[PDB]
Design a protein around this ligand. Structure first.
Ligand SMILES: Oc1nc(-c2ccccn2)nc2c1CSCC2
Ligand SMILES: [Zn+2]
Length: 210
């Protein structure tokens, strides 16, 4: 079902995805332990994911959420990093892709900062790093993450952990907001796979700083 269409570096679409990817980078408090040490990426490839079946399920669910939220789906483009990016782009988000130990329970987690999702590309805590060198800060191996369409609808806002099986009643997602003793950066959780579509597949390296 899924077709990958390579975007050209001169396309305005490639450029706006690239800029979001680069501009939403932050320096993490773990000193790069999980995701590596870098200030920016080398963006090699951005591909559009075209799967009609997945898109239609996504738009059908988006319609439902929107009608349940005063005609506002509250859609945003958000990043997702995962060792499962290949299964995701062919068959969609399902419960294998959930982060069970997440602070808001087993849902699918998205970030508005690419570097946050970069921490999960090789696994939770960055796992054991790249398959070839077992280096969480590998500059050689090429990484992939997704820039996704996410339907948040009416989002339930939290500053601290609260483990849930689904979005609270009358809500369609949970947003972790940044706070003093809490999160450094935002996080967004959906508990239904049809509320995200993996629109862009980004191949990149983290860059070694000067
Ligand atoms: O992009 C992300 N991915 C994952 C993740 C976790 C387990 C399996 C697959 N992905 N977690 C988070 C983010 C970004 S928001 C913080 C949590
Ligand atoms: Zn490597």
């Amino acid at each position: 079902g899924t077709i990958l269409i390579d975007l050209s570096p001169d396309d305005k679409e490639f450029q706006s995805v690239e800029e979001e990817m680069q501009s939403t980078v932050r320096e993490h408090r773990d000193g790069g332990h999980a995701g590596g040490i870098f200030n920016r990426y080398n963006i090699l490839k951005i591909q559009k994911v075209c799967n009609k079946k997945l898109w239609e399920r996504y738009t059908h669910r988006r319609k439902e959420v929107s009608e349940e939220n005063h005609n506002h789906a509250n859609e945003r483009m958000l990043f997702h990093g995962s060792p499962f990016v290949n299964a995701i782009i062919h068959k969609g988000f399902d419960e294998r892709h959930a982060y069970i130990g997440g602070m808001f329970g087993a849902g699918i987690y998205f970030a508005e900062n690419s570097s946050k999702s970069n921490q999960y590309v090789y696994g939770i805590g960055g796992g054991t790093g790249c398959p070839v060198h077992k280096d969480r800060s590998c500059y050689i191996c090429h990484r992939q993450l997704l820039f996704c369409r996410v339907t948040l609808g009416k989002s339930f806002l939290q500053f601290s952990a609260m483990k849930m099986a689904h979005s609270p009643p009358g809500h369609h997602s949970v947003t972790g907001r940044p706070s003093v003793n809490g999160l450094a950066l935002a996080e967004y959780v959906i508990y239904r796979g049809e509320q995200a579509y993996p629109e862009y597949l980004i191949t990149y390296q983290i860059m070694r700083p000067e």
